[PDB]
Design an enzyme around this catalytic site. Sequence first.
Site, PDB file in Angstrom:
ATOM      1  N   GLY A  50      -1.143  18.433  -4.292  1.00 36.32           N
ATOM      2  CA  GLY A  50      -0.702  19.810  -4.201  1.00 36.32           C
ATOM      3  C   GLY A  50      -0.352  20.291  -2.806  1.00 36.32           C
ATOM      4  O   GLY A  50       0.028  21.458  -2.661  1.00 36.32           O
ATOM      5  N   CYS A  68       2.133  19.110  -0.873  1.00 34.24           N
ATOM      6  CA  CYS A  68       3.524  18.956  -0.486  1.00 34.24           C
ATOM      7  C   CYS A  68       4.181  20.311  -0.294  1.00 34.24           C
ATOM      8  O   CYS A  68       3.866  21.305  -0.980  1.00 34.24           O
ATOM      9  CB  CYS A  68       4.294  18.159  -1.528  1.00 34.24           C
ATOM     10  SG  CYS A  68       3.832  16.415  -1.420  1.00 34.24           S
ATOM     11  N   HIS A 105      11.083  16.855  -4.999  1.00 33.21           N
ATOM     12  CA  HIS A 105      10.377  16.231  -6.122  1.00 33.21           C
ATOM     13  C   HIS A 105       9.593  17.225  -6.985  1.00 33.21           C
ATOM     14  O   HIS A 105       8.968  16.791  -7.969  1.00 33.21           O
ATOM     15  CB  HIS A 105       9.483  15.064  -5.635  1.00 33.21           C
ATOM     16  CG  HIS A 105       8.266  15.448  -4.850  1.00 33.21           C
ATOM     17  ND1 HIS A 105       8.206  15.320  -3.482  1.00 33.21           N
ATOM     18  CD2 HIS A 105       7.026  15.827  -5.245  1.00 33.21           C
ATOM     19  CE1 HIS A 105       6.997  15.650  -3.060  1.00 33.21           C
ATOM     20  NE2 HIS A 105       6.261  15.965  -4.108  1.00 33.21           N
TER      21      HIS A 105
HETATM   22  C1  LIG Z   1       2.809  16.302  -2.902  1.00 29.00           C
HETATM   23  O1  LIG Z   1       1.789  17.326  -2.965  1.00 29.00           O
HETATM   24  C2  LIG Z   1       2.096  14.889  -2.902  1.00 29.00           C
HETATM   25  C3  LIG Z   1       1.268  14.675  -1.570  1.00 29.00           C
HETATM   26  C4  LIG Z   1       0.416  13.409  -1.680  1.00 29.00           C
HETATM   27  C5  LIG Z   1      -0.707  13.606  -2.726  1.00 29.00           C
HETATM   28  C6  LIG Z   1      -1.898  13.002  -2.098  1.00 29.00           C
HETATM   29  N1  LIG Z   1      -1.710  12.904  -0.617  1.00 29.00           N
HETATM   30  C7  LIG Z   1      -0.348  13.148  -0.393  1.00 29.00           C
HETATM   31  O2  LIG Z   1       0.112  13.112   0.775  1.00 29.00           O
HETATM   32  N2  LIG Z   1       3.147  13.865  -2.927  1.00 29.00           N
HETATM   33  C8  LIG Z   1       3.210  12.820  -3.832  1.00 29.00           C
HETATM   34  O3  LIG Z   1       2.301  12.696  -4.708  1.00 29.00           O
HETATM   35  C9  LIG Z   1       4.380  11.813  -3.789  1.00 29.00           C
HETATM   36  C10 LIG Z   1       5.487  12.236  -4.836  1.00 29.00           C
HETATM   37  C11 LIG Z   1       6.752  11.318  -4.760  1.00 29.00           C
HETATM   38  C12 LIG Z   1       7.431  11.398  -3.375  1.00 29.00           C
HETATM   39  C13 LIG Z   1       7.771  11.658  -5.876  1.00 29.00           C
HETATM   40  N3  LIG Z   1       3.936  10.439  -4.077  1.00 29.00           N
HETATM   41  C14 LIG Z   1       3.084   9.773  -3.189  1.00 29.00           C
HETATM   42  O4  LIG Z   1       2.668  10.332  -2.155  1.00 29.00           O
HETATM   43  O5  LIG Z   1       2.668   8.474  -3.428  1.00 29.00           O
HETATM   44  C15 LIG Z   1       1.362   8.081  -2.940  1.00 29.00           C
HETATM   45  C16 LIG Z   1       1.110   6.624  -3.519  1.00 29.00           C
HETATM   46  C17 LIG Z   1       0.292   5.764  -2.551  1.00 29.00           C
HETATM   47  C18 LIG Z   1       0.019   4.384  -3.161  1.00 29.00           C
HETATM   48  C19 LIG Z   1      -0.635   4.515  -4.553  1.00 29.00           C
HETATM   49  C20 LIG Z   1       0.218   5.346  -5.511  1.00 29.00           C
HETATM   50  C21 LIG Z   1       1.571   4.609  -5.681  1.00 29.00           C
HETATM   51  C22 LIG Z   1       2.305   4.473  -4.317  1.00 29.00           C
HETATM   52  C23 LIG Z   1       1.400   3.696  -3.311  1.00 29.00           C
HETATM   53  C24 LIG Z   1       2.502   5.906  -3.732  1.00 29.00           C
HETATM   54  C25 LIG Z   1       0.499   6.736  -4.909  1.00 29.00           C
END
Ligand SMILES: *[C@H](O)[C@H](C[C@@H]1CCNC1=O)NC(=O)[C@H](CC(C)C)NC(=O)OC[C@]12C[C@H]3C[C@H](C[C@H](C3)C1)C2
EC number: 3.4.19.12
Lengths: 300, 297
Positions: free
Chosen positions: A142, A144, A40
Amino acid sequence: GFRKMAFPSGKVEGCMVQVTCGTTTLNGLWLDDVVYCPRHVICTSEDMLNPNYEDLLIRKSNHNFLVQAGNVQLRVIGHSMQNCVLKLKVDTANPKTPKYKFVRIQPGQTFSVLACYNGSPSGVYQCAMRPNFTIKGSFLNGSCGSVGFNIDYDCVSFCYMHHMELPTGVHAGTDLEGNFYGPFVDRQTAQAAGTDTTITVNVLAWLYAAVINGDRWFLNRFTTTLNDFNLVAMKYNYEPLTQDHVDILGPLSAQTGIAVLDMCASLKELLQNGMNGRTILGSALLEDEFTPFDVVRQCS
Amino acid sequence: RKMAFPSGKVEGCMVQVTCGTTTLNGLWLDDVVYCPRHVICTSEDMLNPNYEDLLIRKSNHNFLVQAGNVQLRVIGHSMQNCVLKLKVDTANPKTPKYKFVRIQPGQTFSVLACYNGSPSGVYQCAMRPNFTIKGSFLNGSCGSVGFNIDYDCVSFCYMHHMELPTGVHAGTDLEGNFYGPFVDRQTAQAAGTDTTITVNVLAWLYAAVINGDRWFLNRFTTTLNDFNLVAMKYNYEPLTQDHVDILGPLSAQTGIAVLDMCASLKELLQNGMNGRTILGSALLEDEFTPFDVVRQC
Ligand SMILES: *[C@H](O)[C@H](C[C@@H]1CCNC1=O)NC(=O)[C@H](CC(C)C)NC(=O)OC[C@]12C[C@H]3C[C@H](C[C@H](C3)C1)C2
Ligand SMILES: *[C@H](O)[C@H](C[C@@H]1CCNC1=O)NC(=O)[C@H](CC(C)C)NC(=O)OC[C@]12C[C@H]3C[C@H](C[C@H](C3)C1)C2
């Protein structure tokens, strides 16, 4: 007296880089001449609800990927996607590459997480894979591409790469082949984990640890079959035991002389009657995030 | 999550030091190896040592220093309090930017537990108010160090020397001075009465709130002195105004005033948790500092 103890992280620190597409930066793992990271990284904030990753990757070239170790750019010479991980071939072999393997762990197994931001390590902590295939991490925006690992002798076994958070605050990710643990997908959607359960094999390890340290009031005179125990365990939201669980308790069973199924009968009694006010290893709660290997390390 | 600093910068400094059949770990910085002085003791000497007497009877060649499979030649030695300083003829290119610091009770640090010069595990410790640490250390762990990292700078604050009969641990700073009233003699030593690190419990209650755990909050309030009276009754450390200031950022983030959180903690001390838990714990946790909590957000 039983700390959560992580593996020394230096061998993994030596493999962490940052990968950027545009302004989207996450962490990657640099081993030999390949960098591994979550796919992603190629998404924009509009792709993320249901990205067409194959289409998004077609629109990328090697020259769209900024890979850096610190401030020093690593030239990308090829790119491919394997499940949910991107593999970027680079023109330099990482001189800090340890002996390593990629492994897929089972629920209940523990590992160390090196939490990183912009390719720079922030901290290291021990995690257990829950039976519902989530971990209770500490991960901010950040993070991931941060990885989970175990170290055996010289060899780093990489088992987890971080991808997302669930609405309940817990975390989900893949192995280093990009296959998610659990029924999760890398889309910014609300996804629910299964109801979690207690890691029975680890509770048994904890009880063996208590015996090793002289705390053994809970040993009873009886035994159980594995199947009878499993049917009772499920009524208390405990995981059923597998044959591999019975086997990995072997060393502790041998150290204490207490057969696995006899300890199961002791745990069954604890579940049916409670602690009756008593403690084990100075705690009224049974601990389920130390594995049999984790016990053997700290005890002996 | 109890989180330790990444240990790589320290791993690159760990060596094995042997004298006779006594082996422990040393810290190799530039051209000096630092290690506990009781490496010069036989297991018999350890029962009651005169260290200056034992050390005069030693030559540079009685010290075997090994960095992996590679022996380092000792070219000088000296003793500083309870630490031995072994000058070697090779500088460590993996030496980080570092300093030696003496930490205060209540502050935290990471421990890199080592055996035979090889790192084994890393975990987070607090210096207890009674100057013990609730470590995980076995035979051969002496010379393992505790440290904090700020930017690229490793601040070494602890070197491991001994275990007490209660199972807790004692050691020195990197100048060789013990934390607490302990001595490097193999004798049973008791510590003073321990207390709970109040400013850290408050930091962790704020962490419970940030992660959506609020069952323990209340509307009561308290003055600082009235809280401190109750704290001391329960063998909790006094809270100073500096502690209140240090908690400010966490107070701002959650919008709960420090003295309001003090009123919640007072109720927990007087009433208990009633079989409930906070961040998964049935006990109040006091080995996270405010800074620890912030960094991890
Ligand atoms: C990569 O660094 C981040 C790690 C996240 C950020 C905060 N804590 C983490 O573990 N990954 C993402 O941001 C990820 C990206 C997608 C896979 C494309 N999205 C994600 O983790 O979604 C979290 C939420 C949780 C609830 C509120 C809102 C919408 C959905 C339900 C998904 C964000
Ligand atoms: C150096 O590797 C060891 C670390 C110890 C061993 C076990 N756990 C540890 O943390 N240091 C020593 O062995 C130390 C040597 C003296 C400083 C000369 N001795 C020591 O720690 O003694 C511990 C005991 C604990 C109780 C049983 C027995 C007698 C005393 C009470 C002291 C040993």
